[PDB]
Amino acid sequence: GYVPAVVIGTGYGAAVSALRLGEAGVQTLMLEMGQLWNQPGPDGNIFCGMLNPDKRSSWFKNRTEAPLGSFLWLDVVNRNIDPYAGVLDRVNYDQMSVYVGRGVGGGSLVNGGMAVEPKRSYFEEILPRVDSSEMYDRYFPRANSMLRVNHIDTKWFEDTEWYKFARVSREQAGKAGLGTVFVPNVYDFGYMQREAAGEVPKSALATEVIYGNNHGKQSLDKTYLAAALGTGKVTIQTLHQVKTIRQTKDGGYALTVEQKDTDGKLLATKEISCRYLFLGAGSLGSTELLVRARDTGTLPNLNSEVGAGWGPNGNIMTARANHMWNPTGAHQSSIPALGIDAWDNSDSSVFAQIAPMPAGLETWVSLYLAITKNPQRGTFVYDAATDRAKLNWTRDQNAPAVNAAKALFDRINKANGTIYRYDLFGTQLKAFADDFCYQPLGGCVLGKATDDYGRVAGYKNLYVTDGSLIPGSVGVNPFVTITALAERNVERIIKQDV
Ligand SMILES: Cc1cc2nc3c(=O)[nH]c(=O)nc-3n(C[C@H](O)[C@H](O)[C@H](O)COP(=O)(O)OP(=O)(O)OC[C@H]3O[C@@H](n4c[nH+]c5c(N)ncnc54)[C@H](O)[C@@H]3O)c2cc1C
């Protein structure tokens, strides 16, 4: 049927767009290919933890996987599973694996909650056509309030066993002249204290994050999407995947939409049409819809920039072996709290998360997720034979990222007399994981595939709202930028177009 506005997906861009549309009185339907995560599973919890993965952990996989960095300790808990509409999807391309959330809330279900505004001078570099004053004066503050960003108590942080891992890396970094910063989060740190005191059910302190948090984490279903539903003008249909988009003869857009069950069985294919169409299917999903539409002739006036400009936000993972006198602890909160800020907008820039590990026993390992400045980009290109977007990225394109991460951590190793671990990512000696991404950015870049507000070039009333807009890098964990940019864009679109 017809609905005035459709939003594809229910991640950050989608959730912002739907809230503001509803508040503007536009009846809006959100279509989400994953589940609404609200039914208790066979253990009484909605989500599985990292030490007890089951089918809920994985989008249509036949075996669970260990969280990257953790295979040496967590492969022992892996099991064969039925393919199922689980919450975390590892999307494998020829030389890159991209991890994305699947469900109402998107990646907000599975992410580490780190809520960070980019450095203004870097924002100005990457998006020179955007007025940065509005962003820092209005839209970034609006996003941090709406998202429920909060800050860890410093006294508790300093005292608790659950953050010893972070304090160890702070001390080691300090010996190399590097400081750390507290990273704000959407996980409720007051709740986390009470977890440690035994007062409330544990989630972050019970090795949960990457397959969902049963408590504490204010994912988008609790913040923007709850508010959007509260407008009385928004509905969400789950297990509905948009497959094609065309521009109707009489105006507007029509979608082919597959309804599946949680085993993946096709139940129905529906046509749904609208006046205004907003894509919030993520860097991967929005870009795939648009290259498909261009290259199958259903949106033939899309430009050549659709598909281009993808990058993994410079993501590299590495680890250091601590001295025996610097144990990182058996008890590590699953929510990071500290990063190493060595980002100066130069090519040696690194913003590194001090990442917890879920082993649950002492391993002496310090794990890091580095965000770097690597100019290399990939392109999604339509494969008509399999009807999929393929990401043309090669592992050598991450060499500048590896090089930047290694130069920073080599300074830390030199100052402390420590070495890398080489065995955390496979049998081959490899200290740097360079073929994954948690933070995909680009494919429908703002100002190149779209105007400066996400209006898709060549079309009216067709909008992209999500990480596909970002030109491959923001220098920090991206969801606050996605959210703020979506606030800016939908406000303008409603004022001028709706
Ligand atoms: C393990 C992990 C850790 C991360 N840690 C952080 C962190 O602490 N801080 C940070 O800032 N970022 C973090 N990220 C990245 C962050 O979650 C991500 O940048 C955003 O979620 C992207 O938001 P979008 O709105 O672009 O997109 P996203 O949240 O991926 O939402 C897209 C939604 O669209 C749905 N969808 C896709 N295709 C279709 C279709 N054709 N039809 C229907 N529905 C569809 C999809 O299932 C999903 O719910 C992390 C991500 C992962 C996977």
Coordinates of C-alpha atoms and ligand atoms in Angstrom, one line a residue:
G1 CA 0.0 0.0 0.0
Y2 CA 0.7 3.8 0.1
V3 CA 2.3 5.7 3.1
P4 CA 3.3 9.3 2.8
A5 CA 6.9 8.6 4.0
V6 CA 8.9 5.4 4.1
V7 CA 12.1 5.1 6.0
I8 CA 14.3 2.0 5.1
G9 CA 16.1 0.7 8.1
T10 CA 16.1 1.6 11.8
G11 CA 19.6 2.7 12.6
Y12 CA 20.8 6.2 13.5
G13 CA 20.0 8.1 10.3
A14 CA 16.7 6.3 10.0
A15 CA 15.7 6.9 13.6
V16 CA 16.4 10.6 13.6
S17 CA 14.5 11.0 10.3
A18 CA 11.5 9.1 11.5
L19 CA 11.2 11.1 14.8
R20 CA 11.3 14.4 13.1
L21 CA 8.9 13.4 10.3
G22 CA 6.5 12.2 12.9
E23 CA 6.8 15.3 14.9
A24 CA 6.1 17.3 11.6
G25 CA 2.8 15.2 11.3
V26 CA 4.0 13.1 8.4
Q27 CA 2.7 9.5 8.6
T28 CA 5.8 7.3 8.3
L29 CA 6.5 3.6 7.9
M30 CA 9.8 2.2 8.8
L31 CA 10.9 -1.0 7.2
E32 CA 13.5 -3.1 9.0
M33 CA 14.9 -6.4 7.7
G34 CA 15.8 -7.7 11.2
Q35 CA 13.8 -8.3 14.3
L36 CA 12.3 -6.2 17.1
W37 CA 14.4 -7.5 20.0
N38 CA 12.0 -7.8 22.8
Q39 CA 11.2 -11.6 23.4
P40 CA 13.1 -13.5 26.0
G41 CA 15.0 -16.4 24.6
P42 CA 15.7 -19.9 26.0
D43 CA 17.8 -18.5 28.8
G44 CA 15.2 -15.9 29.7
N45 CA 17.2 -13.1 28.2
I46 CA 16.6 -11.2 24.9
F47 CA 20.3 -11.3 23.8
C48 CA 23.0 -13.9 24.2
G49 CA 26.3 -12.9 25.9
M50 CA 29.8 -13.4 24.5
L51 CA 30.5 -16.4 26.6
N52 CA 27.2 -18.2 25.6
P53 CA 26.7 -17.4 21.9
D54 CA 23.7 -19.1 20.2
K55 CA 21.7 -18.5 17.0
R56 CA 20.7 -15.0 18.3
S57 CA 24.3 -13.9 17.9
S58 CA 24.4 -14.3 14.2
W59 CA 22.6 -13.2 11.0
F60 CA 22.1 -16.4 9.0
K61 CA 25.3 -18.2 9.9
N62 CA 25.7 -21.9 10.7
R63 CA 28.3 -21.5 13.4
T64 CA 29.0 -18.9 16.1
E65 CA 32.2 -16.8 15.9
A66 CA 34.5 -15.4 18.6
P67 CA 34.7 -11.6 18.9
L68 CA 37.7 -10.5 17.0
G69 CA 40.8 -10.5 19.2
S70 CA 39.3 -13.2 21.4
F71 CA 39.5 -16.5 19.4
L72 CA 42.3 -17.9 21.6
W73 CA 40.0 -17.9 24.6
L74 CA 36.4 -17.9 23.2
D75 CA 36.6 -20.4 20.4
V76 CA 35.9 -23.0 23.1
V77 CA 32.4 -21.7 23.5
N78 CA 31.6 -21.7 19.7
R79 CA 28.8 -24.0 18.5
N80 CA 27.0 -24.9 15.4
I81 CA 23.7 -23.0 15.1
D82 CA 20.7 -22.9 12.8
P83 CA 20.7 -20.0 10.4
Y84 CA 18.5 -17.4 12.1
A85 CA 17.7 -13.7 12.0
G86 CA 20.2 -12.9 14.8
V87 CA 21.6 -9.6 15.7
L88 CA 25.1 -9.3 14.3
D89 CA 25.9 -9.8 10.6
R90 CA 29.4 -10.3 9.4
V91 CA 29.2 -9.3 5.7
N92 CA 32.1 -10.9 3.8
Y93 CA 33.5 -9.1 0.7
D94 CA 36.5 -10.3 -1.2
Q95 CA 39.1 -8.7 1.1
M96 CA 37.1 -7.1 3.8
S97 CA 34.6 -8.2 6.4
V98 CA 32.1 -5.6 7.5
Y99 CA 30.1 -6.1 10.7
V100 CA 26.6 -4.6 11.0
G101 CA 23.6 -4.8 13.3
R102 CA 20.4 -6.3 12.2
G103 CA 17.2 -5.3 14.0
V104 CA 15.2 -2.4 15.3
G105 CA 17.9 0.0 16.2
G106 CA 20.6 -1.2 13.8
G107 CA 24.1 -1.0 15.0
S108 CA 23.0 0.6 18.2
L109 CA 22.0 -2.9 19.3
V110 CA 25.5 -4.3 19.0
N111 CA 27.9 -1.3 19.3
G112 CA 30.1 -0.3 22.1
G113 CA 28.1 2.8 22.8
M114 CA 31.0 5.1 22.4
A115 CA 29.6 8.6 21.6
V116 CA 32.2 11.0 20.4
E117 CA 32.1 14.3 18.5
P118 CA 34.8 14.6 15.8
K119 CA 37.4 17.3 16.0
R120 CA 36.0 20.4 14.4
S121 CA 39.0 21.1 12.3
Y122 CA 38.8 17.5 10.9
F123 CA 35.1 17.8 10.2
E124 CA 35.9 21.0 8.3
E125 CA 38.5 19.1 6.3
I126 CA 36.3 16.2 5.3
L127 CA 33.0 18.2 4.7
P128 CA 34.1 21.6 3.5
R129 CA 30.7 22.4 2.0
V130 CA 28.8 22.0 5.3
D131 CA 28.5 24.9 7.7
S132 CA 30.4 23.7 10.7
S133 CA 29.0 26.4 13.1
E134 CA 25.5 25.0 12.9
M135 CA 26.8 21.5 13.5
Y136 CA 28.8 22.4 16.7
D137 CA 26.3 25.0 18.0
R138 CA 23.0 23.2 17.3
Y139 CA 23.1 19.7 15.9
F140 CA 25.9 18.0 17.9
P141 CA 24.4 19.1 21.1
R142 CA 20.9 18.0 20.1
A143 CA 22.2 14.5 19.2
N144 CA 24.1 14.1 22.5
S145 CA 21.0 15.0 24.5
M146 CA 18.6 12.9 22.4
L147 CA 21.1 9.8 22.4
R148 CA 21.4 9.9 26.3
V149 CA 25.1 10.4 26.2
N150 CA 26.6 10.2 29.7
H151 CA 30.0 10.2 31.4
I152 CA 31.7 7.7 33.7
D153 CA 32.3 8.8 37.3
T154 CA 36.1 9.3 37.6
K155 CA 36.4 8.1 41.2
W156 CA 34.6 4.9 40.5
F157 CA 36.6 4.4 37.3
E158 CA 39.9 4.8 39.3
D159 CA 38.8 2.3 42.0
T160 CA 36.9 -0.5 40.2
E161 CA 38.4 -3.8 39.2
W162 CA 36.3 -3.7 36.0
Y163 CA 38.5 -1.0 34.5
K164 CA 41.9 -2.1 35.5
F165 CA 42.5 -3.0 31.9
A166 CA 42.1 0.6 31.0
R167 CA 44.3 2.0 33.7
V168 CA 47.1 -0.4 32.6
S169 CA 47.1 0.9 29.1
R170 CA 46.9 4.5 30.4
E171 CA 50.0 4.0 32.4
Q172 CA 51.8 2.3 29.6
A173 CA 50.8 5.0 27.1
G174 CA 51.9 7.7 29.6
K175 CA 55.5 6.3 29.6
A176 CA 55.6 7.1 25.8
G177 CA 54.3 10.6 26.3
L178 CA 50.8 9.8 25.2
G179 CA 47.7 10.7 27.1
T180 CA 44.3 9.3 27.3
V181 CA 40.7 10.7 27.2
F182 CA 37.5 9.5 28.7
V183 CA 35.0 8.5 26.1
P184 CA 31.3 9.3 26.7
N185 CA 28.8 6.5 26.2
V186 CA 25.2 5.7 25.8
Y187 CA 25.5 2.9 28.3
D188 CA 24.2 4.2 31.7
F189 CA 27.3 4.4 33.8
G190 CA 25.2 4.8 37.0
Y191 CA 23.6 1.5 36.2
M192 CA 27.1 0.1 35.6
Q193 CA 28.2 1.1 39.1
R194 CA 25.2 -0.7 40.6
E195 CA 26.0 -3.7 38.5
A196 CA 29.4 -3.9 40.2
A197 CA 27.8 -3.4 43.6
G198 CA 25.5 -6.4 42.9
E199 CA 22.4 -4.3 43.0
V200 CA 21.0 -4.8 39.5
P201 CA 21.3 -7.4 36.8
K202 CA 24.7 -7.4 35.0
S203 CA 25.2 -6.8 31.3
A204 CA 28.3 -4.8 30.6
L205 CA 29.9 -6.6 33.7
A206 CA 28.6 -10.0 32.4
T207 CA 30.4 -10.1 29.1
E208 CA 27.6 -8.7 27.0
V209 CA 27.9 -6.1 24.2
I210 CA 28.5 -7.3 20.6
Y211 CA 25.4 -9.5 20.5
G212 CA 23.3 -7.0 22.4
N213 CA 23.0 -5.8 26.0
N214 CA 20.2 -7.1 28.1
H215 CA 20.5 -4.1 30.4
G216 CA 22.1 -0.6 30.6
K217 CA 22.7 0.3 27.0
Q218 CA 20.4 3.0 25.7
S219 CA 20.1 1.7 22.1
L220 CA 18.0 3.6 19.6
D221 CA 14.9 1.5 20.4
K222 CA 14.9 3.2 23.8
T223 CA 15.7 6.8 22.6
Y224 CA 14.9 8.1 19.1
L225 CA 12.7 5.2 18.1
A226 CA 10.6 5.1 21.2
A227 CA 10.1 8.9 20.7
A228 CA 9.2 8.4 17.1
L229 CA 6.6 5.8 18.0
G230 CA 5.3 8.2 20.6
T231 CA 4.4 10.8 18.0
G232 CA 1.5 8.5 16.9
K233 CA 2.7 9.0 13.3
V234 CA 5.3 6.3 12.9
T235 CA 5.0 2.5 12.6
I236 CA 7.8 -0.1 12.3
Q237 CA 7.4 -3.3 10.3
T238 CA 10.1 -5.9 11.0
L239 CA 11.5 -8.8 9.0
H240 CA 10.8 -6.7 5.9
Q241 CA 13.7 -6.2 3.5
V242 CA 13.5 -3.7 0.7
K243 CA 14.8 -5.2 -2.5
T244 CA 14.1 -2.7 -5.3
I245 CA 13.2 1.0 -5.6
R246 CA 11.6 2.7 -8.6
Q247 CA 10.1 6.1 -9.4
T248 CA 6.2 5.5 -9.9
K249 CA 4.7 6.7 -13.2
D250 CA 2.3 9.0 -11.3
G251 CA 4.9 10.2 -8.9
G252 CA 6.6 9.1 -5.8
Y253 CA 8.5 5.9 -5.2
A254 CA 7.5 2.2 -5.2
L255 CA 9.3 -0.5 -3.3
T256 CA 9.4 -4.3 -3.6
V257 CA 9.6 -5.6 0.0
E258 CA 10.2 -9.2 1.1
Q259 CA 8.6 -10.4 4.3
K260 CA 10.5 -13.3 6.0
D261 CA 10.2 -15.3 9.1
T262 CA 13.1 -15.6 11.6
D263 CA 14.3 -18.8 9.8
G264 CA 14.6 -16.9 6.6
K265 CA 11.6 -18.3 4.9
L266 CA 9.9 -16.0 2.3
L267 CA 6.3 -15.3 3.5
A268 CA 5.2 -12.6 1.1
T269 CA 6.5 -10.0 -1.4
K270 CA 4.7 -6.7 -1.1
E271 CA 4.6 -3.5 -3.0
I272 CA 4.7 -0.4 -0.8
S273 CA 4.7 3.2 -2.3
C274 CA 5.3 6.6 -0.9
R275 CA 5.7 10.3 -1.6
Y276 CA 8.9 10.8 0.4
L277 CA 11.6 8.0 0.6
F278 CA 14.4 8.0 3.1
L279 CA 17.2 5.5 3.0
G280 CA 18.7 4.6 6.4
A281 CA 19.9 1.1 5.5
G282 CA 23.5 1.9 6.4
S283 CA 26.7 2.4 4.4
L284 CA 26.3 -1.1 3.0
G285 CA 22.5 -1.3 2.7
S286 CA 21.7 2.1 1.3
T287 CA 24.5 2.0 -1.2
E288 CA 23.5 -1.5 -2.4
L289 CA 19.9 -0.3 -3.0
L290 CA 21.1 2.6 -5.1
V291 CA 23.7 0.8 -7.2
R292 CA 21.2 -1.9 -7.8
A293 CA 18.6 0.7 -8.9
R294 CA 21.0 2.5 -11.1
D295 CA 22.4 -0.5 -12.8
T296 CA 19.1 -2.4 -13.2
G297 CA 17.5 0.7 -14.7
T298 CA 14.9 1.4 -12.0
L299 CA 16.5 4.7 -11.0
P300 CA 18.4 5.4 -14.2
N301 CA 19.3 9.0 -13.5
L302 CA 21.5 8.2 -10.4
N303 CA 25.0 9.6 -10.9
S304 CA 28.4 7.9 -11.2
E305 CA 29.3 8.8 -7.5
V306 CA 26.7 6.3 -6.2
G307 CA 28.9 3.5 -4.9
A308 CA 32.0 5.5 -4.5
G309 CA 34.0 6.8 -1.6
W310 CA 33.8 4.0 0.9
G311 CA 36.2 3.5 3.7
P312 CA 36.4 1.6 7.0
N313 CA 37.0 4.7 9.1
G314 CA 40.6 3.6 9.2
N315 CA 39.8 0.7 11.5
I316 CA 42.7 -1.5 12.6
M317 CA 42.9 -3.8 15.6
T318 CA 46.1 -4.7 17.5
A319 CA 47.3 -6.0 20.8
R320 CA 50.2 -5.8 23.2
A321 CA 51.6 -8.4 25.6
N322 CA 51.9 -6.8 29.1
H323 CA 54.7 -7.5 31.5
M324 CA 53.6 -10.1 34.1
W325 CA 53.5 -7.3 36.7
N326 CA 50.8 -5.5 34.7
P327 CA 47.8 -7.9 34.6
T328 CA 44.8 -6.4 33.0
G329 CA 42.3 -8.4 35.1
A330 CA 39.9 -11.3 34.9
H331 CA 37.0 -8.9 35.2
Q332 CA 36.8 -6.3 32.4
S333 CA 33.7 -4.2 31.6
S334 CA 32.5 -4.8 28.1
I335 CA 32.1 -1.1 27.5
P336 CA 35.3 0.8 26.8
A337 CA 35.8 4.0 28.8
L338 CA 39.3 5.3 27.7
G339 CA 41.0 6.1 24.4
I340 CA 44.4 7.2 23.3
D341 CA 44.0 10.5 21.4
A342 CA 46.9 10.9 19.1
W343 CA 44.9 12.6 16.3
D344 CA 46.3 15.8 14.9
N345 CA 44.8 15.6 11.4
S346 CA 48.1 14.5 10.0
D347 CA 48.7 11.2 8.3
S348 CA 50.2 9.8 11.5
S349 CA 46.9 10.4 13.3
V350 CA 45.5 7.7 15.5
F351 CA 42.5 7.7 17.9
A352 CA 42.6 4.3 19.7
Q353 CA 40.0 2.7 21.9
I354 CA 41.4 0.7 24.8
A355 CA 39.3 -2.3 24.3
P356 CA 38.2 -4.8 26.9
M357 CA 38.5 -8.5 26.4
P358 CA 35.9 -10.9 27.4
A359 CA 38.1 -14.0 28.3
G360 CA 37.2 -13.9 32.0
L361 CA 40.6 -15.0 33.0
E362 CA 44.0 -13.2 33.1
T363 CA 45.7 -13.1 29.8
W364 CA 48.0 -10.0 30.1
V365 CA 46.8 -8.8 26.8
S366 CA 45.9 -5.2 26.0
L367 CA 43.7 -4.8 23.0
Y368 CA 43.2 -1.7 20.9
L369 CA 40.9 -0.5 18.1
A370 CA 42.7 2.2 16.2
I371 CA 40.9 4.8 14.0
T372 CA 43.4 6.2 11.4
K373 CA 43.6 8.7 8.5
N374 CA 44.1 6.6 5.3
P375 CA 43.0 8.2 2.0
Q376 CA 42.3 4.9 0.3
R377 CA 38.7 4.4 -0.8
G378 CA 36.8 1.5 -2.2
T379 CA 33.8 1.3 -4.6
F380 CA 30.7 -0.8 -4.5
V381 CA 29.9 -2.2 -7.9
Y382 CA 26.8 -3.9 -8.9
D383 CA 27.0 -7.6 -9.9
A384 CA 23.9 -8.3 -12.0
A385 CA 24.6 -12.0 -12.0
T386 CA 24.1 -12.4 -8.2
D387 CA 22.1 -9.2 -7.7
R388 CA 24.5 -7.9 -5.1
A389 CA 26.8 -5.0 -4.5
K390 CA 30.4 -6.1 -4.4
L391 CA 33.0 -3.9 -2.5
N392 CA 36.1 -3.3 -4.5
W393 CA 38.5 -2.9 -1.6
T394 CA 41.8 -4.8 -1.5
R395 CA 43.8 -5.5 1.8
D396 CA 46.8 -3.5 0.5
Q397 CA 44.6 -0.4 0.6
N398 CA 44.7 -0.7 4.4
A399 CA 48.5 -0.4 4.4
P400 CA 48.5 3.3 5.4
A401 CA 46.2 2.5 8.3
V402 CA 48.4 -0.3 9.5
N403 CA 51.4 1.9 9.1
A404 CA 49.9 4.6 11.3
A405 CA 48.7 2.3 14.0
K406 CA 52.0 0.5 14.1
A407 CA 54.0 3.7 14.4
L408 CA 51.9 4.7 17.5
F409 CA 52.0 1.4 19.2
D410 CA 55.7 1.0 18.4
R411 CA 56.3 4.0 20.4
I412 CA 54.4 2.5 23.4
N413 CA 56.3 -0.8 23.0
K414 CA 59.7 1.0 22.9
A415 CA 58.9 3.0 26.0
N416 CA 57.8 -0.1 28.0
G417 CA 60.0 -2.8 26.6
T418 CA 56.9 -4.9 25.5
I419 CA 56.1 -6.7 22.2
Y420 CA 53.0 -7.2 20.2
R421 CA 50.9 -10.3 20.3
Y422 CA 51.0 -12.0 16.9
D423 CA 48.6 -14.9 17.4
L424 CA 45.2 -13.3 18.1
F425 CA 43.8 -13.1 14.6
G426 CA 44.8 -16.5 13.1
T427 CA 47.6 -18.9 12.8
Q428 CA 49.8 -16.7 10.6
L429 CA 51.9 -14.2 12.6
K430 CA 49.8 -11.1 12.3
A431 CA 49.9 -8.2 14.8
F432 CA 47.4 -6.0 13.0
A433 CA 44.0 -7.0 11.8
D434 CA 43.5 -5.1 8.6
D435 CA 40.5 -6.7 6.9
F436 CA 37.6 -6.0 9.2
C437 CA 35.4 -3.0 9.7
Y438 CA 32.9 -2.1 12.5
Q439 CA 32.4 1.5 11.2
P440 CA 31.7 1.5 7.4
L441 CA 31.5 5.0 6.0
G442 CA 30.6 6.2 2.5
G443 CA 29.2 4.8 -0.7
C444 CA 26.6 7.7 -1.1
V445 CA 28.8 10.6 -0.1
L446 CA 27.2 13.9 0.9
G447 CA 27.8 16.4 -1.8
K448 CA 28.8 13.9 -4.4
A449 CA 26.1 11.3 -4.8
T450 CA 23.7 13.7 -3.0
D451 CA 23.4 17.4 -2.3
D452 CA 24.6 18.8 1.0
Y453 CA 21.5 17.6 2.8
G454 CA 21.4 14.0 1.5
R455 CA 19.0 14.6 -1.4
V456 CA 19.9 12.0 -4.0
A457 CA 21.1 13.6 -7.2
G458 CA 18.8 13.2 -10.1
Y459 CA 15.7 12.7 -8.0
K460 CA 13.1 14.7 -5.9
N461 CA 12.0 13.6 -2.5
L462 CA 14.6 10.8 -2.4
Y463 CA 16.9 11.0 0.6
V464 CA 19.9 9.2 2.1
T465 CA 20.3 9.7 5.9
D466 CA 23.0 7.4 7.2
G467 CA 26.7 6.4 7.3
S468 CA 26.7 6.1 3.5
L469 CA 26.9 10.0 3.5
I470 CA 30.2 10.2 5.4
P471 CA 33.3 10.4 3.2
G472 CA 35.1 7.3 4.5
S473 CA 36.5 8.8 7.7
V474 CA 35.6 10.9 10.7
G475 CA 38.5 10.3 13.0
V476 CA 36.4 9.0 15.9
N477 CA 33.6 6.5 16.5
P478 CA 30.9 7.6 14.0
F479 CA 27.4 7.3 15.4
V480 CA 27.3 10.8 17.0
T481 CA 28.3 12.3 13.6
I482 CA 25.7 10.2 11.8
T483 CA 23.0 11.3 14.3
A484 CA 24.0 15.1 14.1
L485 CA 24.2 15.1 10.4
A486 CA 20.8 13.4 10.2
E487 CA 19.3 16.0 12.5
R488 CA 20.7 18.8 10.3
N489 CA 19.5 17.1 7.1
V490 CA 16.0 16.1 8.1
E491 CA 15.3 19.6 9.6
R492 CA 16.2 21.2 6.3
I493 CA 14.4 18.7 4.2
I494 CA 11.1 19.0 6.2
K495 CA 11.3 22.8 6.0
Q496 CA 12.0 23.1 2.3
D497 CA 10.5 19.9 0.7
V498 CA 7.8 18.5 2.9
Ligands
LIG1 C1 30.8 -4.4 16.8 C2 30.5 -3.0 16.5 C3 31.0 -2.0 17.5 C4 30.8 -0.6 17.2 N1 31.2 0.3 18.2 C5 30.9 1.7 17.9 C6 30.9 2.6 19.0 O1 31.1 2.3 20.2 N2 30.6 3.9 18.6 C7 30.3 4.3 17.3 O2 30.2 5.5 17.2 N3 30.1 3.4 16.4 C8 30.3 2.1 16.7 N4 30.0 1.2 15.7 C9 29.5 1.7 14.5 C10 28.0 2.1 14.5 O3 27.2 1.2 15.2 C11 27.6 2.4 13.1 O4 28.5 3.4 12.6 C12 26.1 2.9 13.0 O5 25.3 1.9 13.6 C13 25.7 3.2 11.6 O6 24.4 3.8 11.6 P1 23.6 3.8 10.2 O7 22.3 4.5 10.6 O8 24.4 4.2 9.1 O9 23.2 2.2 10.0 P2 23.0 0.9 10.9 O10 23.0 1.3 12.3 O11 23.8 -0.2 10.4 O12 21.4 0.6 10.5 C14 20.9 0.1 9.2 C15 19.7 -0.7 9.5 O13 19.1 -0.9 8.2 C16 18.7 -2.3 8.2 N5 18.6 -2.6 6.8 C17 19.7 -2.7 6.0 N6 19.3 -3.0 4.7 C18 17.9 -3.0 4.7 C19 17.0 -3.2 3.7 N7 17.3 -3.4 2.4 N8 15.7 -3.2 4.0 C20 15.4 -3.1 5.3 N9 16.2 -2.9 6.4 C21 17.5 -2.8 6.0 C22 19.6 -3.0 9.0 O14 19.2 -4.4 9.3 C23 19.8 -2.0 10.2 O15 19.0 -2.2 11.3 C24 30.1 -0.2 16.0 C25 29.6 -1.1 15.2 C26 29.8 -2.5 15.5 C27 29.3 -3.6 14.5

